[PDB]
């Protein structure tokens, strides 16, 4: 309630630090190839198992409200990093703890934690600069499989399947991931404009092999309203029999006398028509039919909303497609012709929508997969023998996917944690304005060493020996903690996307340096 | 979120292992011929009695949340096995515990439990290979009765009755199991298309013995809409009296003037018609009536899309059936004529439908029972003197049924637990990549011995003596724990379907090897 | 007996390790020049402040009986180290924790912790060997002041004053330490055989300057009984006036007519006698008079067994001393003649006495100072403005004293912690018999780095960076943590006695390696 309780200084700082340290200690066991999993109790079902830092971090709230404040801030950093990049979460967590501890310890009476924060931010800017300098953009699609396999915790089959899918769909094409029933992974590739609606009548079937309606060089008619008996349908058929092409009709429904005309002209004078229901869900179907309209080139009849009526059609009011296949369950349209400019406009609209949409009514992606399917889309059906396994593997696959996209879009840099280690000399050539800022730069200078020593510590080895051996060693070499020895990093394939290394550090330092500024904490009473 | 509490390392591992060990210890007493039952309190009724591993596992949740985590994972194993195979449950449980214990014990600081998991999974693949090598596909229907009787815990009458039903319905036909009212088991066989709806009026009755309407060489009319209509019924009767054959009419209802015409023409000019309500209800009736349509050859009237109206019928638009019997409660149609291609097509559709997501798609099985082999379904009415007896017995019968199907569809292999024991040499010829994987292969190597040693331990004998005596002995011989001595296994009838032995091991290792990877556990506070 | 409760495996190991880690964490803040003090509540008085590892360790018992078991064992190592060497205590604790942690972590199912102990002990033998190779025996008395000053936490005045006392009393002479009343330190040196008893009569005084009785080349008479004379004194006076030497008389008392004869012969015909009461009291006084007997030569009169009577004295039954000074409060005897063999036998007797006997009846040391005063003894009156200051400082002085003695008697080796670091290559050339022993040697190999990394960590610097920089650097150079930079170690004065470095490690590894062998813990119920 309204009643509250407050705490002052290094005592409260030590409590919040206890919370930070607890959550970080829980998260940090997952890090690297020799990292380990964390089980989390689920309220309704069987427990989650995960190696994902952020999903561990969000799962931990604390009874002690101050420790819970620390915990909430650390899961804030891990969540921000997962949102902005999709990997690098554990790294962001251990970094955030390091900045928070090294920050808290250096505070005194004469010290000015805000200015120290300023120094830290100077140092992180200076670091990401040198990171971008270090970045070398991806070229060979072997590097893709490397980034994927490393982000998937050494599963080569994952990074292989991601590499081939990314080849067959394109580096900025659509790849999505979902559960299999198969015990193994599967790559499915869809081409066209597929949606889960089938012919209204069996009588439309043409091949008898598969029981499909198969057409080529066809037109498409798009109706936002039902087409019942009105014979607003017939001109669309006269115009169709005119140009001797097959016709597909997509509508809210097609029934009454209209359908009877359709399967009479189909069954008696082998006319080539098929009719299918609009993909259909209330207001969503309008957006879908407008999508298929824009893709296939042409316009939707019926509206709210303006109105083009079905009685007055012209050949430029239809749609035009290279091929079409329909079954009892689903309809696929292929090589539809329209303005590519306008379709890229449409995709640019839906992506810019999706990005600002706050809402997990994810059909907006279901839209985006469709109109982008004229390049292709890949479905990643993940296997395994049990649901918890499937959720683990899928977490890792999604991580590797986001990592590969970050790699192609920004760059790749050394793995292990070496990429941050090499940035220390850039800090050595800084010019601090005052003691506080110098403390900040020192904090970052120590903090950069952390991820690599942590990956080594999880391996069971003397991590800080390994860090210093790496620093003494040349720029191209680092520590392979899985193989347990030093190697050329890029040659052995140990590499991290630059975007993730950037975002982990920037977010972690960003919230932790603010945390270190605290002098008074105010919390609700139990 | 909710306040939480976390635990680190071998302490938490020891707690989860306490839970696993408790649940496994409860489940494992049921194993084998000398196994024993477990009573489970029911909230509302008299207590359950069972020998089923999975039903034991599902019944046990634990107050200690960590132990409950272990327990939940083990019941996940037993449930996955029961879903995927239907018998191998106790085995999957004891296997899962063995992998979990032997896993947990071998972890240290330098160890890499993920890599150990990889080694374990390697070992399971290598084992299942040799299992498939060992598999000999079923041939004689004596072997059917053998797998059934062993899966039914030695009840010969069960495997006899299952053998009879499977003979008289076919190896991939439909057998179902239900309560008797009789003190003994009964095999009933239904032929045709039975459903639980009766004549609307008594006046339709023809036999006076049984009070049935009995027809042969009859026509059938299928209406999705009600027929209360004035004379939208009549042409359908004129066409029937024309070809002098009996007519059955199935509709949402027949109730208005139509019915009056029906029983006037019935009572005054003894025409052979009966009318019955559609099987019901709602959207289900559509699928059922289309099923009976497709089976009897012909089409459904009323609204689908293309509407065929009741006023315009033709003889090829009805249905044609070898025989029909109807009473007050149920209607059976027999030897209906239609394209067998189209009906097998339909069954192929419903099985691929039902594939997702039975909870609860129970009526999809009620459809498949109707539309599958219009010459072939079996009901297994199990007897006994009390409900608890009936339920235990029915659990065993369902187990034996699933076992017989797994045997017919994949194969049979040695019983006792010997089939897994013989796979050990295949592990002996493996080539582990590192120490961790070697630990994994060792874990599986120890774990394979468990089921046989457990079946012997339940017998009251020195199970691990028996295991080693078996291993020293030849491939064809194993331990008959009921008879208390060694015998040729296949000759004496002790055999297990390969599918269950495969799935138990695969699921158990699949979840337990993941469990062993845990380093931190996070649970809700009480 | 008492109801009890037992715990199994890594759970109990983690509990005991929690206790160890708590106590070690408390002790370890004291380490090195930048180390810090620990306040301990006293039950009766004002709280202790200390930098002494062992005194911190002894103060911490724990409510949780298992954690208390760990704590008890760690204070056991620290106490053993303090007893056997007198410094190196914090070091023994941090080593013990390192061996205990690294030990516990490496345990698994296949592991054999006793054999691991064997490997650890092998490693400790091998390291102390190389330590003895590194040792260079002390030479210049500058090195003394260096060892003292470093062991006194950088107080140069302490090591100066210790150097002075050790010069003027000898390297194996007696130095003792006690509270000053002065605000500054004082070195007092006593020569002779001093004790706190004065002339019975003022009339004995001869010098009038100071009011002392001063004699040279004198005789001494020792009587265990009172002398209220039967004129058992007169032959002893005739024998003294005969050989014209002064006579000092030490007795239980000098009384009655004896004293009258004494100060009559004193005030008249100026005879040179003095008489003083025995040092006292009771049975202690017997041992003291026999001590002075053996030192000054001659024999003690009165009843022991064989009774030597005062009536029959001979000059070889008296005693012979170079000088004597007595005042109202105390008596000092100087350059007493007797068998030096017999004197060293006597001190060797008293040390072997005190060493086995433990009532804090400290007079056995008061004996040792007396009979060893003919080399000399130094009292170290420590100053300060408050009792707590005096006690902390005195702790440090006693530490430096014991350290200087260990340095003189065994040797000196590199400070910082470098001396243990340089021994790692000696471990690198070992030949382990099996995996367990190899684990042990690895444990010691990691543990050797600890003291230096801890001294650096207390400084606020990246200790494990510093360790590796030191290892990369030459043998003669290490890290001056007070000055905050690398230096030649021996040149800068940072050096540790070899005995303490040996004993800390030997004790710590000795108990901790045994601790790691535990599988079951048994404790009393609260
Ligand atoms: N075989 C390996 N050797 C050395 N470093 C590795 C290896 N595999 C992965 N890494 C490093 O470990 C990190 C992977 O962290 P991860 O466990 O995925 O947590 P996050 O979710 O924070 O990425 C990367 O920075 C990568 O460079
Ligand atoms: N008489 C017997 N001798 C030896 N083994 C037997 C005998 N009867 C059954 N078994 C074995 O016991 C196992 C049956 O386990 P069961 O108790 O049904 O539990 P589950 O639910 O795992 O099937 C089979 O693997 C079978 O080989
Ligand atoms: N200026 C210095 N530089 C490096 N090491 C130092 C310095 N002064 C002291 N030490 C180290 O500190 C250790 C003594 O720590 P101390 O606090 O006395 O603990 P302990 O009671 O275990 O001796 C010695 O090993 C010595 O080498
Ligand atoms: Mg990752
Ligand atoms: Mg069974
Ligand atoms: Mg010391």
Curated annotation (Swiss-Prot), chains A, B, C:
It holds the Pfam family Cpn60_TCP1. The modification Phosphoserine is found at residues 43, 46, 386, 464. The modification N6-malonyllysine is found at residue 109. The modification Phosphotyrosine is found at residue 66. One of its GO terms (cellular component) is extracellular space. It catalyses: ATP + H2O + a folded polypeptide = ADP + phosphate + an unfolded polypeptide. CDD domains: GroEL. The modification N6-acetyllysine is found at residues 51, 58, 63, 67, 101, 106, 109, 132, 167, 178, 181, 194, 212, 225-226, 245, 268, 290, 328, 335, 365, 372, 445, 457. ATP binds at residues 51, 87-91, 416, 496. It comes from the Eukaryota. The modification N6-succinyllysine is found at residues 7, 58, 101, 109, 167, 178, 181, 194, 212, 226, 277, 328, 372, 457. Keywords: Acetylation, ATP-binding, Chaperone, Disease variant, Hereditary spastic paraplegia, Host-virus interaction, Isomerase, Isopeptide bond, Leukodystrophy, Mitochondrion, Neurodegeneration, Nucleotide-binding, Phosphoprotein, Transit peptide, Ubl conjugation. GO terms for molecular function: apolipoprotein A-I binding; apolipoprotein binding; ATP binding; ATP hydrolysis activity; ATP-dependent protein folding chaperone; cysteine-type endopeptidase activator activity; DNA replication origin binding; double-stranded RNA binding. InterPro entries: Chaperonin_Cpn60_CS, Cpn60/GroEL, Cpn60/GroEL/TCP-1, GroEL-like_apical_dom_sf, GROEL-like_equatorial_sf, TCP-1-like_intermed_sf. Its EC number is 5.6.1.7. Belongs to the chaperonin (HSP60) family. PANTHER family: 60 KDA HEAT SHOCK PROTEIN, MITOCHONDRIAL. This is 60 kDa heat shock protein, mitochondrial. It comes from Homo sapiens. The gene is HSPD1.
């Amino acid at each position: 309630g309204s009643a509250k309780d407050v705490k002052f200084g290094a005592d409260a700082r030590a409590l919040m630090l206890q919370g930070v340290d607890l959550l970080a200690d829980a998260v940090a066991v997952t890090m690297g190839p020799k990292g380990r999993t964390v089980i989390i109790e689920q309220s309704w079902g069987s427990p989650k198992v995960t190696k994902d830092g952020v999903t561990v971090a969000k799962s931990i709230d604390l009874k002690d409200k101050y420790k819970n404040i620390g915990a909430k801030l650390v899961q804030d950093v891990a969540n921000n990093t997962n949102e902005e990049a999709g990997d690098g979460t554990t790294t962001a967590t251990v970094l955030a703890r390091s900045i928070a501890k090294e920050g808290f310890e250096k505070i005194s009476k004469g010290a000015n934690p805000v200015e120290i924060r300023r120094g830290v931010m100077l140092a992180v800017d200076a670091v990401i600069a040198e990171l971008k300098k270090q970045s070398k953009p991806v070229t060979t699609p072997e590097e893709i499989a490397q980034v994927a396999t490393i982000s998937a915790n050494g599963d080569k089959e994952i990074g292989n399947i991601i590499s081939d899918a990314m080849k067959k769909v394109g580096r900025k094409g659509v790849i999505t991931v979902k559960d299999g029933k198969t015990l193994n992974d599967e790559l499915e590739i869809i081409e066209g404009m597929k949606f889960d609606r089938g012919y209204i009548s069996p009588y439309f079937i043409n091949t008898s092999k598969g029981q499909k309606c198969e057409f080529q060089d066809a037109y498409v008619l798009l109706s936002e309203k039902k087409i019942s008996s009105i014979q607003s349908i017939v001109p669309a058929l006269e115009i169709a029999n005119a140009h001797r092409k097959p016709l597909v009709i997509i509508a809210e429904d097609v029934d009454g006398e209209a359908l009877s005309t359709l399967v009479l002209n189909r069954l008696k004078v082998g006319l080539q028509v098929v009719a299918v229901k609009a993909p259909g869900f209330g207001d969503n179907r309008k957006n879908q039919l407008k999508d298929m309209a824009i893709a296939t080139g042409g316009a939707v009849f019926g509206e709210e909303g303006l109105t083009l009526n079905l009685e007055d059609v012209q050949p430029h009011d239809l749609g035009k497609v290279g091929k079409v296949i329909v079954t009892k369950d689903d309809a696929m349209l292929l090589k539809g012709k329209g303005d590519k400019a306008q379709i890229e406009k449409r995709i640019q609209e839906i992506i810019e929508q999706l990005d600002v949409t706050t809402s997990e009514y994810e059909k907006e992606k279901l839209n985006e997969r469709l109109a982008k399917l004229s390049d292709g889309v890949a479905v990643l059906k993940v296997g395994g023998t049990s649901d918890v396994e499937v959720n683990e593997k899928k977490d890792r696959v999604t991580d590797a996917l986001n990592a590969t996209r970050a790699a192609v879009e920004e760059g790749i840099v050394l793995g292990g944690g070496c990429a941050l280690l090499r940035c220390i000399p850039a800090l050595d050539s800084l010019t601090p304005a005052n003691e506080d800022q110098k403390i900040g730069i020192e904090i970052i200078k120590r903090t950069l060493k952390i991820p690599a020593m942590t990956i080594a510590k999880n391996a069971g080895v003397e991590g800080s020996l390994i860090v210093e051996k790496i620093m003494q060693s040349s720029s191209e070499v680092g520590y392979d903690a899985m193989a347990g020895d030093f190697v050329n990093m890029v040659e052995k394939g140990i590499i991290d996307p630059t975007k993730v290394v950037r975002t982990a550090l920037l977010d972690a330092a960003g919230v932790a340096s603010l945390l270190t500024t605290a002098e008074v904490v105010v919390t609700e009473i139990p």
